[PDB]
């Protein structure tokens, strides 16, 4: 039927996948809990949607919110947009280099940054640094045969992937929207340097200096690099770079901002084994050793981008009743402002959520604390049943107890006073 590989990676560091997380995959097929590992999961599927949720996360991280994914023609989907993860079967197993060799001037000087990356069957296709500061790839004196190792974590590799979802692996970038980022990065590779013995439009201008203005437009929308020739003299020996160069790296960028859409569907990216080496924007695109990735992240719970909501009830007064279910009707809205349509875990029993809503019940003393909810979410929470009573939410008198908040970015708790005198 059609193969997939459930991937957990950590938000941050993608030099290895994310051992230790506990994972269930749910159909709409038996449903089946397993471990993460180095790999991937290896799962055959059929036409159908599946969830997959973690049912708890490795010490150090939050547990991630659940990824519901289509199945439909031999193609993946996630909830509908084509699946953006598609990555070759055994990762950290391409090789990335640097021609060490390879000599050809920006100016006075060697531009000596000649990235590449070896293809399948043994060809190599030109590459570009995504991650300015960080270190190059493996130098090498045989054009790609024999790479040097890093000292720490030996051979650096890389996991091949389609270039798309990009916008995650950069350091500094220019750009705020991940689209509008990829779309960018897409029109500097098209216009620019993308192989060997190419047509170079421009005039005056070899192959490496094409090459050379290419890499600092991606640096550009990366790394927020600026295109001025005070401003590089000490940037990474892009102060041997002459103004001819420059003024085509302006092009190239200037044809990326512009409103016209990108001609290339996609590219090749890499993502070496150690996360103080960069990662690599290619030139060139291979499906054919891509697989589709069910990829699930995890963030490090000291800096969450999900949250708790705790509600707990108190009765006040000599003539209140102790022994009372109260009813609360709770809405729920994402980042976006839609209704949450989603099984919301919970310290008692999950709660299933439907067109945003769902009640819960309290009696005096008792609480309940709602997980996982999304960064920038927005809640209303009415007491139903408040009659009788003189309600206080977190001690502020609300006369219809019914109180809300909005793009929420931390955990909060909405502790209810029910007060009834004699």
Not at 113 to 121: R, V
Not at 181 to 200: C, N, P, T
Not at 258 to 283: A, E, M, R, V
Request: with cysteine; proline share 4%.
């Amino acid at each position: 039927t059609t193969s997939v590989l459930i991937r957990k990676y950590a938000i941050g560091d993608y030099s290895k996948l994310l051992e230790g997380a506990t994972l269930q995959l749910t159909g709409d097929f038996q449903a089946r809990v397993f471990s993460s590992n180095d790999i991937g999961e290896r799962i055959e599927l059929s036409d159908g949607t599946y969830t997959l949720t973690e049912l708890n996360s490795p010490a150090g991280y939050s547990i991630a919110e659940p990824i519901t994914f289509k199945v439909e023609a031999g193609k993946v989907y996630t909830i509908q947009i084509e699946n953006p993860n598609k990555e070759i079967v055994e990762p950290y197993s391409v090789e990335a280099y640097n021609d060490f060799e390879e000599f050809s001037v920006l100016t006075t000087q060697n531009y000596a940054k000649f990235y590449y990356a070896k293809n399948k069957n043994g060809s190599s296709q030109v590459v570009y640094c995504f991650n300015a500061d960080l270190k190059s790839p493996p130098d090498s004196e045989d054009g790609g045969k024999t790479m040097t190792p890093d000292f720490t974590t030996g051979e650096v590799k890389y996991t091949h992937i389609a270039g798309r979802d990009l916008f995650k692996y950069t350091v500094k970038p220019r750009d705020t929207d991940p689209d509008t980022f990829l779309k960018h990065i897409k029109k500097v590779i098209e216009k620019g340097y993308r192989e060997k013995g190419q047509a170079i439009e421009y005039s005056g201008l070899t192959e490496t200096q094409l090459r050379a203005a290419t890499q600092l437009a991606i640096y550009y929308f990366t790394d927020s690099a600026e295109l001025d020739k005070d401003k590089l003299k000490d940037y990474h020996g892009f102060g041997d770079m002459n103004d001819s160069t420059l003024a085509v790296a302006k092009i190239l960028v200037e044809y990326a901002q512009d409103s016209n859409p990108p001609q290339l569907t996609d590219l090749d990216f890499f993502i070496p084994n150690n996360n103080k080496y960069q990662s690599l924007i290619g030139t060139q695109w291979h499906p054919e050793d891509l697989v589709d990735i069910i990829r699930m992240e995890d963030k490090k719970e000291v800096i969450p981008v999900t949250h708790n909501l705790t509600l707990r009830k108190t009765v006040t007064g000599l003539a209140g009743d102790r022994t009372k279910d109260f009813h609360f009707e709770i809405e729920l809205k994402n980042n976006k402002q839609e209704l949450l349509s989603q099984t919301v875990k919970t310290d008692k029993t999950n709660l299933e959520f439907k067109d945003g809503k769902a009640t819960i019940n309290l009696k005096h003393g008792e609480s309940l604390t709602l997980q996982g909810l999304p960064e920038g979410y927005s809640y209303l929470v009415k007491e139903t049943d408040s009659e009788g009573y003189k309600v206080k939410v977190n001690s502020q008198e609300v006369a219809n107890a019914t109180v809300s908040k909005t793009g929420i970015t931390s955990d909060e708790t909405l502790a209810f006073e029910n007060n009834k005198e004699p």
